């Protein structure tokens, strides 16, 4: 699609068989989901935002579908206000800023 | 003009004389700027993301020239990591997301 910014950019992702709304987020390097059950192992990551830094759990090669589009990347699980879909998976699904 | 998200999306912004650069960010509702002093009165606000909340000074109808193009709107001045160009001015310069 073509998504305008007058409304917040929520889209349905589908991770592990459940639907969730995540935000299309260009200000973000990574994809940061709220606390959930990812499969396998994790490693620790420091990631800062606006309030500053936080410790996340990182899962590699997670298959998340986004508006019926498949990415296989690195998902960070942590305390975010909302589900962030960041640059890492936006490049995967061929997302561009247009003006 | 398609912008790719291979790299963090940073544009020049001309503000009060100055040429600064900011991040085009679909995750931000409002525009936050490095601590500076705008003309007029402000309303204090708390904006929070990852790592929590910070305290900004709201200034309504501030003219930003975002990579050539002008946009009026509210601008927050606070302790931000990076100047952020949010959804507020983005639509103004008719920015959109595609895939």
């Amino acid at each position: 699609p073509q998504i305008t910014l007058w409304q917040r950019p929520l889209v349905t992702i589908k991770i592990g068989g459940q639907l969730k709304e995540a935000l299309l987020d260009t200000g973000a390097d990574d994809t940061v989901l709220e606390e959930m059950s990812l499969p396998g192992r994790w490693k620790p990551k420091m990631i800062g935002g606006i309030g500053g830094f936080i410790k996340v759990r990182q899962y590699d090669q997670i298959l998340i579908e986004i508006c019926g589009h498949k990415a296989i990347g690195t998902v960070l699980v942590g305390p975010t206000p909302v589900n962030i879909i960041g640059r890492n998976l936006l490049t995967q699904i061929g997302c561009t800023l247009n003006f | 003009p398609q912008i790719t998200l291979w790299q963090r999306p940073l544009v020049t912004i001309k503000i009060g004389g100055q040429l600064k650069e900011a991040l085009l960010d679909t995750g931000a509702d409002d525009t936050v700027l490095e601590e500076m002093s705008l003309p007029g009165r402000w309303k204090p606000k708390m904006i929070g993301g990852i790592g929590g909340f910070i305290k900004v000074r709201q200034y309504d109808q501030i003219l930003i020239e975002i990579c050539g193009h002008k946009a009026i709107g509210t601008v927050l001045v606070g302790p931000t990591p990076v100047n952020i160009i949010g959804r507020n001015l983005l639509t103004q310069i008719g920015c959109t997301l595609n895939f």
């Binding site: 200000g27 973000a28 940061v32 990631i47 | 993301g49 990852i50």
Partner: peptide
């Protein structure tokens, strides 16, 4: 915004 989300860095690092």
């Amino acid at each position: 915004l989300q860095e690092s």
